[PDB]
Amino acid sequence: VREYQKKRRRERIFRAAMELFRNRGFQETTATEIAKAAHVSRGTFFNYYPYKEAVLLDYGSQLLAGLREEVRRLLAQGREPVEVLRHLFRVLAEGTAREKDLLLPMFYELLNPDPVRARAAFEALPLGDLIAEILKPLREQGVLRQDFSLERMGRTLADLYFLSALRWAAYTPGRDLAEELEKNLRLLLEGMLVREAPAP
Amino acid sequence: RRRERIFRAAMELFRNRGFQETTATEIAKAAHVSRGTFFNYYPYKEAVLLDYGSQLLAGLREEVRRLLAQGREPVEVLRHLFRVLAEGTAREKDLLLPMFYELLNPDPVRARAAFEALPLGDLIAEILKPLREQGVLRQDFSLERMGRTLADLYFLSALRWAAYTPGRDLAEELEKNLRLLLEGMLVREAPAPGG
Ligand SMILES: CCCCCCCCCCCC(=O)SCCNC(=O)CCNC(=O)[C@H](O)C(C)(C)COP(=O)(O)OP(=O)(O)OC[C@H]1O[C@@H](n2cnc3c(N)ncnc32)[C@H](O)[C@@H]1OP(=O)(O)O
Ligand SMILES: CCCCCCCCCCCC(=O)O
């Protein structure tokens, strides 16, 4: 019973924090307000979430898990891997824009000077590995290079998504993020060098 | 000579005591100027790093334009540029890290100033020009845009390397960025390629 009670307590604290972050802002909301809203002590809030960003990482992990189900579902349905890739970035751009105010402070956590926290953020948001799953079928199809691992190429594309999304959210939210992510995808997938146009 | 005296004094304190630990007050004293005078030249400490970075880039720019002039192949010049960047980043990691972080300073005004002081993307675009003229680069993206994307990959790689994982071979990491962005992840196995 204690296990269930702890999971329930963590979820209530999580819900309480997300609502406050949404309604009043992430930076403006304190651990004491979250604790009060979830009916726990300030000390208990920290036992579950050592720092406020850990709450956002939990949300990000949830978002990524949904994207993982979606990607696996599409591949299983027989969608072309490249189209699944384009779709993923399209939805990533759309979702990032919808949740901009919550995701921005989350993105900075991946740049935390403290390496333990940067690593924690990285492990909670493994987009690189999800991309690698889409590249896999391409490698088996013989159209993907094999001098670099799937994980390394996936990591690279995810790193680009990260920098584009962060700069978009922090400095140029008026620009078209979907267009920017499509640019990253095309450039890394096809390269800057021209390719063969098939016969009509 | 005050701008140069301040820069020199600041770099020496950073060298001997550390960038984070050094204060404007100490730099001013070491350069024999008031704190007020120091700020006219450098509004904030990281601006000294931008000046340093801008100078390193100017050096690379000379070397690059020079090699192209003497007929070196564009791709080879690009390969050279990144070998140089990897080596330099490794040698000056402690001072370059806070500079890299200033590039993502939440304050848009500061982020912009940093970007404009360190235009690596524009230099890469200069190197791509001969390739554009040969007609072998896609035209749905400008040279500046593609060059800036390759510079972004250098930034991401260098920041990770310097802040979290210096055990990686940074030179190979940058060659990987170059290979992937130039050639793409998709194979190039046309039995009859162009050229
Ligand atoms: C909806 C919102 C979405 C939101 C989606 C958000 C996406 C964000 C994406 C990331 C954005 C950024 O990180 S921006 C960059 C700045 N931030 C960061 O880097 C985050 C913090 N970074 C780190 O903690 C580190 O750099 C890591 C964890 C990323 C990687 O470090 P690491 O694993 O020690 O080192 P790495 O170079 O990866 O691996 C070294 C060798 O170990 C090998 N190796 C592989 N597996 C293992 C293993 N099980 N056990 C031992 N070794 C292994 C690797 O193949 C490699 O071999 P070999 O081939 O080398 O010989
Ligand atoms: C020898 C070290 C030279 C360091 C040059 C740093 C250039 C950083 C460019 C960052 C571009 C960007 O992604 O905004």
Q: Yes or no: say if A130 and A67 are a contact pair by the CB < 8 Å rule.
A: yes
Q: How far is B81 from chain A (nearest CA, A)?
A: 18
From which experimental method does this structure derive? X-ray
> Which residue in chain A has the smallest CA separation from B190?
A196
Q: What's the resolution in A?
A: 2.0
Burial B127-151 (b: 16+ CB within 10 A, else e): bbeebbeeeebeeebebeebbbbbb
Residues near A46 by beta carbon (within 8 Å), at least 6 away in sequence = A31
For A116, B37, B159, the CA distances from B156, given in Å and listed in that order, are: 18, 35, 5
Cα atoms in the 13 Å half-sphere on the side-chain side of A147: 12
The CATH number assigned to the domain holding B97 equals: 1.10.357.10
Residue of B157, B153, B186 whose CA lies nearest to A144 = B186
Are the C-beta atoms of B182 and B86 separated by less than 8 Å?
no
Q: Tell me the ligand closest to B99's alpha carbon.
A: 2
Distance CA A190, CA A85 (A): 13
CA dihedral B180, A116, B90, B62 (to 10 degrees): 60
Under DSSP, is residue A107 helix (H, G, I), strand (E, B) or coil?
A: helix
Rounded to the nearest whole angstrom, what is the distance from the C-alpha of residue A132 to the centroid of ligand 1?
Answer: 13
Best residue for ligand 2 mutational test, from B102, B155, B157, B161 (most atoms within 8 Å of Cβ) = B155
Range of the domain at A198: 1-200
CA of B151 to the centre of ligand 2 (A): 7
Write B74-79 long-range contacts (CB < 8 A, 24+). B74/B127, B74/B128, B74/B129, B74/B130, B74/B131, B75/B131, B75/B182, B77/B127, B78/B124, B78/B127, B78/B178, B78/B182, B79/B175, B79/B178
How many C-beta atoms lie closer than 10 Å to residue A68's C-beta? 16
- Residue A3 Cα, gap to closest chain B Cα (Å): 35
Minimum-distance ligand 1 atom for the alpha carbon of A149: 59
CA dist., res. B17 & res. A87, Å (int): 50
- Residue A29: CB atoms within 10 Å: 21
Distance in Å, alpha carbon of B181 to nearest chain A alpha carbon = 5
Contact assignment for B186 to A188 by CB distance below 8 Å: no
C-beta of residue A37 within 8 angstroms of C-beta of residue A29:
no
CA distance A148 to A144: 10
Provide the 8-state DSSP code for A113.
S
Q: Do A138 and B182 touch (CB under 8 A)?
A: no
Instruction: Among A115, A159, A193, select the one facing B182 at the smallest CB separation.
Output: A193
End-to-end CA distance of chain A: 66
Q: Flag if A153 and B186 touch (Cβ within 8 Å).
A: no
For residue A142, give the DSSP letter: T
Q: Do A188 and B188 touch (CB under 8 A)?
A: no
Domain count, chain A: 1
Tokens read off for A9: 């307590």
